[PDB]
């Protein structure tokens, strides 16, 4: 995923929380999905994914540790 500084459409919304972005806001693009920095995080610990690596379970994204503890 990549860090972007938002200057896009006013219709653009966060994939996680559905909220909008402000001009020049530092956001994250992961596989074409846009996120607030506080939203591109593990659903269980709310922390950034180490090395950007996440694992999906039923529509939510998890860090390795939490995926292994709960779902693997």
């Amino acid at each position: 995923s990549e860090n972007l500084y938002f200057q896009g459409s006013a219709s653009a919304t966060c994939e996680r929380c559905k909220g909008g972005f402000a001009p020049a806001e530092k956001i994250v693009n992961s596989n074409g999905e846009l996120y607030h920095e506080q939203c591109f995080v593990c659903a269980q610990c709310f922390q950034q994914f180490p090395e950007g690596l996440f694992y999906e379970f039923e529509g939510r994204k998890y860090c390795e540790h939490d995926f292994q503890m709960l779902f693997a």
């Binding site: 929380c17 269980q44 610990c45 709310f46 922390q47 939490d66 503890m69 709960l70």
Partner: protein
């Protein structure tokens, strides 16, 4: 197909029959420590949740990540189940392995009515998790401001409380 799947899917008759056999352990967790009650709460299976509680299921059981059924009901926005768990004395400020309480998840996932219900029942808004984040600070701004206001009117102290437990220091 086992008890865990029946609880996830809401197969109430199967769950009832399984519970009828007292040789079965209604508290026993699956491979990741999810008890029948964890699964029923997570998936919104109200009738199964009530059955398990009334037949004596332990309310504060923890899975592998130390989530309780209340954490799961709150995270997935199951308002009636949250109320039922609270009625039967679930620990409203139960902490998981990250020091997150149910309110953290209600806030993070914008489960506004669950979040408000939690605060109405005394859920602490100012208690940091292990990484210094208070539950209300996981919410979007409207909800965040609201819950602090509601907490204040409920006689909470709004001073930030750094995480502590018996093994922390």
């Amino acid at each position: 197909d086992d008890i865990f799947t029946q609880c996830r899917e809401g197969n109430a008759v199967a769950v009832r029959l399984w519970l009828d056999n007292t040789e079965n352990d209604l508290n026993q967790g699956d491979d990741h420590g999810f008890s029948p009650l964890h699964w029923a709460c997570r998936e919104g299976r109200s009738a199964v949740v009530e059955m398990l509680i009334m037949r004596g299921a332990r309310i504060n059981v923890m899975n592998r990540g130390d989530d309780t059924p209340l954490h799961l009901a709150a995270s997935h926005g199951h308002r009636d189940i949250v109320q039922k768990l609270l009625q039967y004395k679930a620990d409203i400020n139960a902490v998981n392995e990250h020091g997150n309480v149910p309110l953290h998840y209600a806030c993070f996932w914008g489960q506004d009515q669950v979040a408000e219900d939690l605060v109405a029942n005394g859920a602490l808004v100012s208690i940091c998790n292990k990484y210094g984040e208070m539950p209300v600070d996981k919410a979007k701004a409207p909800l965040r401001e609201l819950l602090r206001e509601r907490a204040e009117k409920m006689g909470q102290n709004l001073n930030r409380i750094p995480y502590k437990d018996t093994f922390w220091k």
